[PDB]
Structures are given as C-alpha cells and as structure tokens.
Design an enzyme around this catalytic site. Structure first.
Site, PDB file in Angstrom:
ATOM      1  CB  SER A  81     -58.794 -22.161  -1.979  1.00 30.75           C
ATOM      2  OG  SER A  81     -57.502 -21.791  -1.547  1.00 30.75           O
ATOM      3  CG  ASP A  96     -63.374 -37.344 -13.801  1.00 27.32           C
ATOM      4  OD1 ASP A  96     -62.934 -36.410 -13.105  1.00 27.32           O
ATOM      5  OD2 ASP A  96     -64.014 -37.178 -14.869  1.00 27.32           O
TER       6      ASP A  96
END
EC number: 3.4.23.22
Length: 330
Positions: A199, A35
């Site tokens: 992004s 994770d």
C-alpha cells in the site's frame, strides 16, 4: 468457464464469511470460509473426532461415488490465530458457484482445535493463497483456483465482501457492474505464498494522506485490519477514550464513540473504510467498551489487509503468470 457464489457473514459483526461448496457425487454442500491467506481446502468430515464436532455439516467420503483416498497423504495446518486442524486426504469433485473441478484434494479433518469446534457455522476452509503453502505431505496439492485456472475464461477470482450483508466470489471474470470508477492494479510478491502487496499510505478521517509504503497481505480469512503500530496509534488517537488494553488484547474504544474513516492507498488510488466498518462491538455482552477493527500487527510479523479493509473494495486476485491485485471502490 466461470463460477459465481454468494458469500454470507456468519454473524452480525462480519467475523467471517461462508460460501456454499458442493463436494462429491451426489453433491454434499458444505459452507466453507474462503481464505486468501491459506492454501488448504479442508472440511469437517465423518472422520472428525466426534467430540470436536458441534453442529457443523460434515463431508462423508464413503457416500460419494467420486471420492478416492489419496493414499498416504496427510495434512496439518496452524493459523495465525493459533487454531489448527489435521487429517488425511481424498480427491473428489468440487463445485463453487457452477464452476467444477474434478480431482480436487479435499482434506478431511481428523482433529480440529477448539475455535473450529465452537463455530458451528463454518464447515471448513477453502484456501485461495498460492499452492506453495499447501500442507499436504508427501505430495503437495493445488488449490481449487490453481486447478480451475486453465479452464477459466480469465485466470482471476474476485472478492466482493459485504458490510453486514452478503457479497460475492466470482471465478474467471470481472463483473464490471460490481464496482464504481476504475480498478487500480498493484504488484504482488508470491515469495511468502501470499497475495502480498505494498500500500502507498493512509489517512485517518478527513486528515491529510501520509505517503508511506506498507507491505501486507490481502487476506479474506482474517477479520480485522492489522497495520504497523505507528499507523494504528495515529488512528485511535482520533477517538476520545480509545486505548490499547493488554487484558483485552488490542485497542478498545467507548461504544458511545463515532469512529472516523480510514483510507489506504493503492497506487495513486484510495480506498475509504467507513468508520462503522471499524466497530466490532462490545468486548463482552453488555459492556460499554467496544473492540476496534484496526489493530497492531507488531506481534504478527506481517501486516494483514483483512475483511475490514477488503469489504470496502471490489478486489481482483489476478492469477496470470505474473500475479497482481486490483482494487476498486464500490
């Protein structure tokens, strides 16, 4: 040193991925959910409330000659999906794919919430976010990667998740046979303890690319892709009959649909998520309403590049003094 371990989807939807981890002496192998959105290595154990164990493999520290109680240390964690677990702490030897750390904090669960009990395939979590998020008190502990870093050939790990197929976590090296083209690296902020990056935009299907900054986290422990409501609406508007359902808890779409791809930007590079990766199947057994793999982050507080996005790429988690993320197509 290096390590290399195969990671396997827990079910036919890729809801999560499990990777075998050796703990203790002699080894006890548990299948953990790696994770990159949390920083605790915790396991089902001989200390877990018996009614909360349903098929998981447990760690028994009393059977490990290298286990030592970390006296006074406790831990307690809550995840973004509302699940939680807590307990006490041992140090022990932990190996992943041939890479061994001695003295790793192994957080033994005394209590786990129902979603953990109900998932017999996940024996615990192995956190790979930054150690500043580790919940052990009063002495915060380091992640497996942080403990291994100095010994690694290169201070990196990579995630190569499969679509409906196994993939690989590598530690200490970048497998240049595992991706196509070049790796595009992008800056990371560690201010929230995550692999947080920006992004450069998105496209829906064959549509034109929209240049826009989307801050979010690379999170292998989250199944879906959670993005701003504007972006998610633009995606689902291209699917006839798709709608946001408050009763189901997100966007659903007709199971008869063919989904468009979704592209996200990494610098000037582009990662394409095929439409099939966005199909999470019927909302309930036999339903013709299917659950979408791109969902709004509006109720989270952060955008999350979860498995739906990451499995479309070869992803480098660069833990150099200034961390960065790398993405390549594959």
């Amino acid at each position: 040193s290096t390590g290399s371990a195969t990671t396997t989807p827990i079910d036919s939807l890729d809801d999560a991925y499990i990777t075998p981890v050796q703990i203790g002496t002699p080894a006890q192998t548990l299948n953990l959910d790696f994770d990159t959105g949390s920083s605790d290595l915790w396991v089902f154990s001989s200390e877990t409330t018996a009614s909360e164990v349903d098929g998981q493999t447990i760690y028994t520290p009393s059977k490990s000659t290298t286990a030592k109680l970390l006296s006074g240390a406790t831990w307690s964690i809550s995840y973004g999906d509302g699940s939680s677990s807590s307990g006490d702490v041992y140090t022990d030897t932990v190996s992943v794919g041939g890479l061994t750390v001695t003295g790793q904090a192994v957080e033994s669960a005394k209590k786990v919430s129902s979603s953990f009990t109900e998932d017999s395939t996940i024996d615990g979590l192995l956190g790979l976010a930054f150690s500043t998020l580790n919940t052990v008190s009063p002495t915060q502990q380091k992640t497996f990667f942080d403990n291994a870093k100095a010994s690694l050939d290169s201070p990196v790990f990579t995630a190569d998740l499969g679509y409906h197929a196994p993939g690989t976590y590598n530690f200490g090296f970048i497998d240049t046979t595992a991706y196509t083209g070049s790796i595009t690296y992008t800056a990371v902020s560690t201010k929230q303890g995550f692999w947080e990056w920006t992004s450069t935009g998105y496209a829906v299907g064959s549509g034109t690319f929209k240049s826009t900054s989307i801050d979010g986290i690379a999170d292998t422990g989250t199944t879906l892709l959670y993005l701003p409501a504007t972006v998610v609406s633009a995606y689902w508007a291209q699917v006839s009959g798709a709608k946001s359902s408050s009763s189901v808890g997100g966007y659903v779409f007709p199971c008869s649909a063919t989904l468009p791809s979704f592209t996200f930007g990494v610098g000037s590079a582009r990662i394409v998520i095929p439409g099939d990766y966005i199909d999470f199947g019927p909302i309930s057994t036999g339903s013709s309403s299917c659950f979408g793999g791109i969902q709004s982050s509006a109720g989270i507080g952060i955008n999350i590049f979860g498995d739906v996005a990451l499995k479309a790429a070869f992803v480098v988690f660069n833990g150099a003094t200034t961390p960065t993320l790398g993405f390549a197509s594959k």
